Design an enzyme around this catalytic site. Structure first.
Site, PDB file in Angstrom:
ATOM      1  N   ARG A 206      -3.954   2.526  -7.657  1.00 43.94           N
ATOM      2  CA  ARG A 206      -2.700   3.207  -7.348  1.00 43.94           C
ATOM      3  C   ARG A 206      -2.192   2.868  -5.955  1.00 43.94           C
ATOM      4  NH1 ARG A 206      -6.688   6.831  -6.889  1.00 43.94           N
ATOM      5  NH2 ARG A 206      -6.997   7.537  -4.731  1.00 43.94           N
ATOM      6  N   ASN A 207      -3.072   2.446  -5.047  1.00 44.53           N
ATOM      7  CA  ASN A 207      -2.697   2.123  -3.677  1.00 44.53           C
ATOM      8  C   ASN A 207      -2.576   0.621  -3.431  1.00 44.53           C
ATOM      9  OD1 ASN A 207      -2.513   4.811  -2.812  1.00 44.53           O
ATOM     10  ND2 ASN A 207      -4.722   4.917  -2.433  1.00 44.53           N
TER      11      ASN A 207
ATOM     12  N   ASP B 131      -1.067   2.475   1.723  1.00 47.78           N
ATOM     13  CA  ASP B 131      -1.565   3.840   1.881  1.00 47.78           C
ATOM     14  C   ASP B 131      -2.714   3.924   2.878  1.00 47.78           C
ATOM     15  OD1 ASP B 131      -2.384   6.562   1.508  1.00 47.78           O
ATOM     16  OD2 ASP B 131      -1.436   6.505  -0.474  1.00 47.78           O
TER      17      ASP B 131
ATOM     18  N   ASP C 251      -9.419   4.861   1.030  1.00 51.10           N
ATOM     19  CA  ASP C 251      -8.697   5.263  -0.170  1.00 51.10           C
ATOM     20  C   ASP C 251      -8.217   4.024  -0.920  1.00 51.10           C
ATOM     21  OD1 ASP C 251      -7.639   6.850  -2.122  1.00 51.10           O
ATOM     22  OD2 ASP C 251      -5.932   7.570  -0.940  1.00 51.10           O
TER      23      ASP C 251
HETATM   24  C1  LIG Z   1       0.815   3.540  -8.213  1.00 53.29           C
HETATM   25  C2  LIG Z   1       1.479   4.677  -8.514  1.00 53.29           C
HETATM   26  C3  LIG Z   1       2.806   5.072  -7.861  1.00 53.29           C
HETATM   27  O1  LIG Z   1       3.330   6.079  -8.334  1.00 53.29           O
HETATM   28  N1  LIG Z   1       3.444   4.362  -6.780  1.00 53.29           N
HETATM   29  C4  LIG Z   1       4.751   4.838  -6.201  1.00 53.29           C
HETATM   30  C5  LIG Z   1       4.588   5.583  -4.842  1.00 53.29           C
HETATM   31  C6  LIG Z   1       4.430   4.899  -3.647  1.00 53.29           C
HETATM   32  C7  LIG Z   1       3.806   5.599  -2.343  1.00 53.29           C
HETATM   33  C8  LIG Z   1       5.237   3.571  -3.364  1.00 53.29           C
HETATM   34  C9  LIG Z   1       5.540   2.745  -2.233  1.00 53.29           C
HETATM   35  C10 LIG Z   1       5.111   2.938  -0.759  1.00 53.29           C
HETATM   36  C11 LIG Z   1       3.697   2.897  -0.317  1.00 53.29           C
HETATM   37  N2  LIG Z   1       3.317   3.074   0.971  1.00 53.29           N
HETATM   38  C12 LIG Z   1       4.292   3.311   2.016  1.00 53.29           C
HETATM   39  C13 LIG Z   1       3.927   3.503   3.451  1.00 53.29           C
HETATM   40  C14 LIG Z   1       4.898   3.728   4.431  1.00 53.29           C
HETATM   41  C15 LIG Z   1       6.310   3.778   4.060  1.00 53.29           C
HETATM   42  C16 LIG Z   1       6.685   3.608   2.728  1.00 53.29           C
HETATM   43  C17 LIG Z   1       5.687   3.367   1.674  1.00 53.29           C
HETATM   44  C18 LIG Z   1       6.039   3.173   0.266  1.00 53.29           C
HETATM   45  C19 LIG Z   1       6.394   1.606  -2.692  1.00 53.29           C
HETATM   46  C20 LIG Z   1       7.039   0.422  -2.046  1.00 53.29           C
HETATM   47  N3  LIG Z   1       6.908   0.165  -0.640  1.00 53.29           N
HETATM   48  N4  LIG Z   1       7.785  -0.449  -2.843  1.00 53.29           N
HETATM   49  C21 LIG Z   1       7.898  -0.186  -4.214  1.00 53.29           C
HETATM   50  N5  LIG Z   1       7.337   0.870  -4.877  1.00 53.29           N
HETATM   51  C22 LIG Z   1       6.578   1.775  -4.111  1.00 53.29           C
HETATM   52  N6  LIG Z   1       5.873   2.972  -4.536  1.00 53.29           N
HETATM   53  C23 LIG Z   1       5.772   3.589  -5.969  1.00 53.29           C
END
Ligand SMILES: */C=C\C(=O)N[C@H]1C=C(C)c2c(-c3cnc4ccccc4c3)c3c(N)ncnc3n2C1
Length: 307
Positions: free
Chosen positions: A145-146, A159, A141
């Site tokens: 966005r990831n 992700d 994936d």
């Molecule tokens: C790109 C589009 C979007 O809407 N991003 C927002 C959503 C996510 C998931 C996210 C995270 C994030 C990603 N993966 C994780 C895995 C395990 C625990 C927690 C997460 C969190 C994120 C982080 N870590 N910092 C800032 N902004 C984040 N967003 C925004």
């Protein structure tokens, strides 16, 4: 295979302060906050992520599977799981990446992003993906966005909800049904549900196209069910305006029907590093040349807090 000795850290609820909501969407709900390991005079900014659903046992089964993968990665361009919190629905904790995802970043800052930043992100995403290939990980994936943005100069992959570990002599992952980002996966993935490090390269190609188009949607308009027929006619995503043929050819190479003919991540690193050394020769952008809280005394980024 080798034994996975990764440490799964379990975090007390009392260790998290100033939890404020960050975002909600198909990713569930994400919170911003501070993690204060007790005793240590450190305040680590974190992001907490749960499910926009219910404490369904199956939800926790898949949450804890993404936890398993993310707990097992350690690379400057891959986000690591700091720990989990054992609330009703399991919460995944990771380093807060203050500038959000790269997709929304390039969309908001179109008029201020130079070729240097664009090419540098391409190097950095391929470095993380190459690391994932060393760890025998098929991300499944990869997409703009990831990719999270720690600073404009430092991005990391995240992700792992679809990631799979390949066996010591296993070369492919044969999947089953389930929602998949069809506009990002290789033809063989859509037809035979086959996933490899080379199918991740296809996804990388789409991801790069997302950056060079400053956040455009791939196959904007076309419904999902026509993608397989379109890719079989030989049609691919169009050349972005700012993209020299040099850059667009690297994208096209990621979309070969022959998966083994596509570039390898270690090569994408090399090719983009070369281009990042003279960025204006490979991306043509108008104006390129001209392109929190009171708790801060003990704030420490997660990259400086080591076991
Ligand atoms: C790109 C589009 C979007 O809407 N991003 C927002 C959503 C996510 C998931 C996210 C995270 C994030 C990603 N993966 C994780 C895995 C395990 C625990 C927690 C997460 C969190 C994120 C982080 N870590 N910092 C800032 N902004 C984040 N967003 C925004």
């Amino acid at each position: 295979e080798a034994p996975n000795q990764a440490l799964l850290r379990i975090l007390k609820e009392t260790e998290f302060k100033k939890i404020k909501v960050l975002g909600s969407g198909a990713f569930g709900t994400v919170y911003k906050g501070l993690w204060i390991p007790e005793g240590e005079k450190v305040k680590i900014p974190v992001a907490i992520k749960e499910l926009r659903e219910a404490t369904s046992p199956k939800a926790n089964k898949e949450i804890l599977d993404e936890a398993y993968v993310m707990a097992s990665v350690d690379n400057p361009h891959v986000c690591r799981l700091l720990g989990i919190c054992l609330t009703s629905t399991v919460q995944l904790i990771t380093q807060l990446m203050p500038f959000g995802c790269l997709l929304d970043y390039v969309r908001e800052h179109k008029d201020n992003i130079g070729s240097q930043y664009l090419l540098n992100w391409c190097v950095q995403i391929a470095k993380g993906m190459n690391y994932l290939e060393d760890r025998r990980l098929v991300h499944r994936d990869l997409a703009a966005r990831n990719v999270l943005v720690k600073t404009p100069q430092h991005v990391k992959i995240t992700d792992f909800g679809l990631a799979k570990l390949l066996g010591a002599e296993e070369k492919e992952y044969h999947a089953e049904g389930g929602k998949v980002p069809i506009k990002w996966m290789a033809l063989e993935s859509i037809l035979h549900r086959i996933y490899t490090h080379q199918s991740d390269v296809w996804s990388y190609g789409v991801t790069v196209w997302e950056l060079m188009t400053f956040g455009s949607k791939p196959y904007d308009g076309i419904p999902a069910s026509e993608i397989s027929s379109i890719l079989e006619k030989g049609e691919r995503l169009p050349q972005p305006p700012i993209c020299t043929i040099d850059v667009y050819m690297i994208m096209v190479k990621c979309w070969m029907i022959d998966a083994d003919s596509r570039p390898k991540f270690r090569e994408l690193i090399i090719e983009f590093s070369k281009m990042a050394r003279d960025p204006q020769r490979y991306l043509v952008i108008q104006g390129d040349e001209r392109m929190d809280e009171e708790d801060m005394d003990d704030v420490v980024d997660a990259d400086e807090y080591l076991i």
